Amino acid sequence: FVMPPVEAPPPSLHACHPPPWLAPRQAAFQEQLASELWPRARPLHRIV
Amino acid sequence: SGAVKRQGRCDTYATEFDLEAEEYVPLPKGDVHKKKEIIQDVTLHDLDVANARPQGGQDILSMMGQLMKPKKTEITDKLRGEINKVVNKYIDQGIAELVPGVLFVDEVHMLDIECFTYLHRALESSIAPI
Amino acid sequence: QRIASHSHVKGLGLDESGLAKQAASGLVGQENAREACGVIVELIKSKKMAGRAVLLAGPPGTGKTALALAIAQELGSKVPFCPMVGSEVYSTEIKKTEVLMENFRRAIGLRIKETKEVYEGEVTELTPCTISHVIIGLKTAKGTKQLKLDPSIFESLQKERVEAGDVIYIEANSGAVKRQGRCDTYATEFDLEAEEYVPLPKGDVHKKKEIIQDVTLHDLDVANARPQGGQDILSMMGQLMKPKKTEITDKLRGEINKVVNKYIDQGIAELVPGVLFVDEVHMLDIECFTYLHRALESSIAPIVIFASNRGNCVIRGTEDITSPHGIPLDLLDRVMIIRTMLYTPQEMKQIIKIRAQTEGINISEEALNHLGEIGTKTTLRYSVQLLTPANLLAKINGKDSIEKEHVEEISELFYDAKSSAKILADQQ
Amino acid sequence: VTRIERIGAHSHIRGLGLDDALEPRQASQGMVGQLAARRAAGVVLEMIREGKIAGRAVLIAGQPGTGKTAIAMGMAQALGPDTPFTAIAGSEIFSLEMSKTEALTQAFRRSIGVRIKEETEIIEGEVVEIQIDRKVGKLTLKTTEMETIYDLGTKMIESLTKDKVQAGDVITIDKATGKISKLGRSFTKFVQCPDGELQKRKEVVHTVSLHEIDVINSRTQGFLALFSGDTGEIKSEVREQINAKVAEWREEGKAEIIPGVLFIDEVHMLDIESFSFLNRALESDMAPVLIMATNRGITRIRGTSYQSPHGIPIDLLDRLLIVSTTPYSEKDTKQILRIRCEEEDVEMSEDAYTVLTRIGLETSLRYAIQLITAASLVCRKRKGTEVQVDDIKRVYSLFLDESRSTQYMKEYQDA
Amino acid sequence: VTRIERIGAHSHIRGLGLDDALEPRQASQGMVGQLAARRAAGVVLEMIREGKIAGRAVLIAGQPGTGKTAIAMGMAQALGPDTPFTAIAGSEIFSLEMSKTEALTQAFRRSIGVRIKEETEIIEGEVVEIQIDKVGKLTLKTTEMETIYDLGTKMIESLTKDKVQAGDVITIDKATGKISKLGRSFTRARDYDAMGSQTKFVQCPDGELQKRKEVVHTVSLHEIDVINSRTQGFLALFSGDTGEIKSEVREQINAKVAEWREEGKAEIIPGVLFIDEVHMLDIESFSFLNRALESDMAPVLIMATNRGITRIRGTSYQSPHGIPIDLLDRLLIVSTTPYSEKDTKQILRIRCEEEDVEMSEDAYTVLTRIGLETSLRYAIQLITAASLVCRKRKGTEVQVDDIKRVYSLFLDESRSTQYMKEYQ
Amino acid sequence: RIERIGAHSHIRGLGLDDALEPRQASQGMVGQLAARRAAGVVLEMIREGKIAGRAVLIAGQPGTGKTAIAMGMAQALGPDTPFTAIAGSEIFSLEMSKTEALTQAFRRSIGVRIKEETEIIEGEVVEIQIDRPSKVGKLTLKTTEMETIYDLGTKMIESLTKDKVQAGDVITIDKATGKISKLGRSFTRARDYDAMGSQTKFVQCPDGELQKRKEVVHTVSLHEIDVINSRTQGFLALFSGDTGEIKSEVREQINAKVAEWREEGKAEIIPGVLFIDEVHMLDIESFSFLNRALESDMAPVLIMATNRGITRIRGTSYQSPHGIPIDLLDRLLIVSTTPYSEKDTKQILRIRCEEEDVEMSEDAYTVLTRIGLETSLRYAIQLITAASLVCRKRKGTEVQVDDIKRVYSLFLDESRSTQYMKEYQDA
Amino acid sequence: ITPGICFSTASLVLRATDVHPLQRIDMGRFDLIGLEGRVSRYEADTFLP
């Protein structure tokens, strides 16, 4: 039944004028990670 | 928060099947779209540990809580600085209200010399409580 | 440019015959010690002797670290130099033995001439020919060129989402396609759009140029320590850290040495021995010494310089064994010891004048004389400190130079070590 | 009403009360007396603002409670923002996730700022309409002086579909990245629309320290400094090349470094291994001019039975400048108490001031400063307006002090 | 030209100067003197190369600079590179991720070699065509012959996940452990300007498509790290294993190695574990060794300590060589007598022969006398020091005067300590 | 079944009456009337559970029954009341601090039993129909009194197919969740009777109404609650090694929610006992924490067995009685155990030998009591089984005096080995 | 759910510090870990030569 008294968004975002190749590669990295582990993390949804 | 719960199937369909594993809850009342104000009371350490150990829904960053989940060490710029700034932004606009506390450190006589020496800068801080 | 404590020291200052002068390079006095330093500096340039050590012994403030920095400077930049403090060995993340091991593999440099080539320009068209190959047209200010682009890297091409209009890099060696952004002439196509719009390259699309940059052997070891890729969950390598994790002697460094020797035999690589420097060796543990006095006996260990800033004292880790210079007699042997002695009033005055004319402060004679005389009462490292605030006060008073009324008045605002000890004898 | 920061122990300190020639006033900017040490603080502050001769250490010695930390806080306040003033206690380096030497060099890097200039263009207006044709569309922004349409490109349409921003929202759009930010729903959170031009070039400057750069250039999204997840960066591989690249930024017109300030309080907690590292970390170009203080005299050095001033070895003691603070007199103590009362809302009587000054000269200075608020509140208990001598006496009876509490130990407790 | 390994301390020790009858020569293979000690070294090397008994510990002790580490490196060189020889310092086991006992078990298992041999039927040939409809066919080619192969779902999935293409010189075996070995050459310039990092053009294979490959490799018994986790063996390239699970390690690795020894697919070849400066071990590691040497498979131990009656780390007790007596009981101590006026000059001449530092007879005599007065190792540095000092002097042979010139620059431990009368 | 007997398996509880009057040798407890009465008082205080935060210490000579009294209390307490036995040296862990280990130990002896009234069905499956194409089916359950037919739904059909039950099986259907728990098979067999299959076993069908309201109960310890609530790692409270609970975000919330549950009546309380054996191992910091850890309503009573006298406290150089500082020793009251007399040691040996199923002659008892009075009691108890083996090896019936005297010369207790330690083995 | 997401900021000059294609050496000619699961012992010992 416990819950964190506060829940902030996951990323500690960083404002910048970054290079154009960083954000797309990070998005592809997140896409790769999500499509694989979430189907296997489904059983923990009940407790989450 | 984005969290969607499953209270159960509608109550009117209880007569549909003979016996089912679904739970039946009465048709929720009130308007489909409703708001409400909640007067929550929390501490600053909660925000500190929430920004140091983030959480969320449907984000793979939760992996941090499985392989990289030791006790955190919020840096000075995070424990102080930005958290205090956002709390002041909440306060000065009429949404938050500060309430000091009382830190009762019993059996202090057995702390380490390092703890005693850090208490110097700890108490002299303008944020430290009574 | 951030004048440092040893910025004025630019070399040992020996003559063509190897004798020590009072050279303008930044060192005065210490004739015998500077001669020994210049004699050992030839060992480094010889590139034939490995597994050596030199102990700079002497009272504090006598300039042993200055001699080490002069040795480092005289060599130049081609050979690496890795200054390390003895206290740094005590890492709470990884054992000290492997820390010292890696430290020993960092001095050894490695020069290699890579005649690589990359292709840059606005990508004009992609025509993927089960892909047999993909032709890519790159446009630059000097013309356009079409390249058959190894369909195996079409994966990366798609990973970058690059298409006609973008400016990109590509490395001929591995296919390191890098999207710089959209072309300049395509800007404003949408009056509001989050893009970079990098200028069009002006040089020849075919960019073949040699890179003679050097890398360290420890860098190679680290690059070969952990794997790469996110096959299934190995993506975890872009996350929780990799602090100086321990390598293994039996299967990593041996193969590294084998492959490096192979490449050197082919005439591609070029080895350049470095110089390691350990400050305050007395801080190391007795086990660090027991490992060091046997690891430096190998055939690959680079020449090291030991600096002990104290005399006969108990070695750390035993609390009951005294040895000269805080180094055990077992390890104190095999190490050429160079003594560093105290200076004279004249030498202290010369050092102070050098520091002055290096920092950029002009000082009168009567002022410099007493500033150096203070170097006799106090340590040499106190007049150097007093010199600056004197000029600061002078400039505050309009006077651009340092008169005797400033150096003798600023010595009152600050106290030296001995005066503080005298006053602090009350335990508070 | 009450902010996260309240009346602490060093609030009255607003900076060094020096003249144009670094001459301390009798009492100014909340700093009483302490002429010699305060002017020495001024000299070090001036040579810091200069930022040419780096790698200098100073030690503020003196009896316990002789404004050793007040001088540091005043120096910090005078230096003002835009210049890193790192303050840490000698016990903070003892960390389990990183070695003491690594924590020390980390604090050093944190005490060095890098000034970089940006020439980004930021939009600021209000949304009139957003369109989506499943994809391309158009965007109409409004300000109090003009309105304009915008062609919603791939990035813009995607970002505005992901975000819930809609018509009637004062927003900002960084054309470089496209970060959308809404400062309030509408006219009256709600907030009015912006004024002036809709799109205007804005210069941005970031005083990022070498620590931030290293943490940014260490891992994939390596900006984990917020919780110090890192246990130590790779020395000489990712830490020396950053220095070379910063030097490249310099002497070219790209960036300029800003010498910060480090203040290690209670340095006697640092062990011999930490002092050994300072003997060489203060000899590099990128080294800040640090200050330190210690109330102990010739005490034992943590690590061995050696006795040395400040508990610091001689090798480092002969490497720094000592700044001793003299004990305060009746005048200085009374003026400090008066400034402390002015900082708060308390207003004591003249006889009350004399009694408190005598009480603070008898046992110690800090005891009187602490009794100030106690007597102020006890006065409000009897429904008074001014803190009279009777209230201070009642407090002195209620609350004990170090010297009087130690003497009351005529009954044996645990041990 | 300059290799990674230039001349070090123990570089002139290129073997053990013993005859066929293990009779020590006065000067042979770089070693000098130490007749009884080198004969004992050869005796222990004989049982090393034999590899029948396990749990043999030979301790070499003597004054500092008598050749303990020298004899150790001589044995290491006399012993062929095939048998493992794990040389570690007494301080290498004090790890933070491993305990003072598990690191020692890993060091022990690292000195036991295992010559594995494997045989697998390999189908290799240049891919000419790959059709897919799921079912398909494969047209492999060689410079000698060609043939079609019918595939299936399991093979099609492996040909798709691994993006094989017409021309890729594929390598397949039973169980389909396919490898994208190399690419055709007839598809000239598949990459005009930019090529992949893993791509490389290779000539067409020869012979038949089906060829039997035999692979032999010597892996240490510490290969447990290969199965101590789910990693692909790369844990052996960094810290990795820390626990050394006794059940797994023993009851799987030992049993399966014994099974391989019967099938003939492997064979143990015990090595040596030389712990230099072993006096730094605590009573815990010594009491552990006391039992570890009693195991079925355990390499022989070689120790080089110069400690007399000294304290044992982790205790207030004192024992010979600074280690407990219960361990000395399970050792075999060897002597290393100090050198004389003749042996010192001989080893100095040998060391000069290494770096071709041609010295004069008077210089040799003076250096031998200096080394007999102060120390042996010190005289070894003056060789190169005087060589470098004379090189700048525009000379070709170190003289006595050049030796004395260096004798004043680099003072010895003795004279250095004698000069510490100032006490800063 | 097979769990070999231990040194403390003979005591089945304190041999007390209804008035806490200890009997001489009842229920395995021999002699030691005062300490047994004290333990009975503290146990009667335990089964009441209206005050929490007290402690009681049992001190005495080595081998007088401290741990014996602890085990007797544990046994007389029975289940349904958490009892945690820990040695002082167990809290010195590497994955958590000492205070954290102490908090976990305390909260491991605080149980929360949530009474859940879930209605279910229980009957013998007679027939099942399921139309695969959504899929639909039916179910028929039989009990000794009545039968009925059910029109299964899609999810009920899915659950029954996952369980894949068949006719004749006796199952329980959770009306809420639909979980099918099969207790066994009724008198039915032979799916085909021509295919292979294991041996058949049958059990009686359920009785009474088909659908009946029964009472389930879920009893977990506060430590298990804080654990599974510590982090989102799935199926915690076993996880083989790891507890890193946070003080406020979890612990205080667990306490508050347990108080709220007690308020409305979901699970009120069931305090336990934390027997900390050999508490002299705890560090000064452990006692410092215990000082204020007992000052909480959720602090269960603890029992400590001490063998030390006037000895320095571990972690410091402060001499104090029982090796415990007078700060923590101020709360706990101490109980004294009297050394067993001749008739007490004799009867203890008699009971301990009757527990191991060994017969010893009347003179065997006398000689063994002689040995256990000149020597320690534990050695005389250990000599009961050792002497019981030579007798069997000689095909004997009951242990004689000669067998005991031979096994006494075969071994050495504590003094015949130190007296012979005159060879200077090693030091 | 605090909307006050911590929002760091810095110039892009701090991110482009490690990108210089025509000034970096190819480390692919020295890596050994990548060859453990791609290249075979036989491929390197018998076929390639």
Ligand SMILES: Nc1ncnc2c1ncn2[C@@H]1O[C@H](COP(=O)(O)OP(=O)(O)O)[C@@H](O)[C@H]1O
């Ligand atoms: N021969 C010299 N010439 C010029 N300056 C010197 C010389 N010797 C010492 N110094 C100065 O004295 C200081 C001694 O510092 P350091 O080398 O750290 O002391 P030590 O090495 O004796 O511990 C240096 O900052 C250096 O500028």
Ligand SMILES: Nc1ncnc2c1ncn2[C@@H]1O[C@H](COP(=O)(O)OP(=O)(O)O)[C@@H](O)[C@H]1O
């Ligand atoms: N120059 C000054 N002006 C105003 N207040 C001062 C001055 N010097 C000291 N004080 C006061 O006296 C107290 C001395 O304590 P502090 O300086 O913090 O002790 P320490 O420096 O030993 O930690 C401070 O709380 C401060 O408010």
Ligand SMILES: Nc1ncnc2c1ncn2[C@@H]1O[C@H](COP(=O)(O)OP(=O)(O)O)[C@@H](O)[C@H]1O
């Ligand atoms: N018999 C020998 N032949 C050649 N060189 C020797 C001989 N004995 C000793 N040395 C030299 O003397 C040095 C002694 O070093 P080391 O073996 O570490 O001393 P010890 O083993 O006595 O502690 C070696 O570097 C070696 O080159």
Ligand SMILES: Nc1ncnc2c1ncn2[C@@H]1O[C@H](COP(=O)(O)OP(=O)(O)O)[C@@H](O)[C@H]1O
């Ligand atoms: N009251 C008792 N009744 C029966 N046996 C006892 C009793 N007290 C002690 N014993 C016997 O003493 C042996 C060890 O006692 P122990 O619990 O270790 O005492 P202590 O806790 O004082 O060391 C046990 O094997 C047990 O059989």
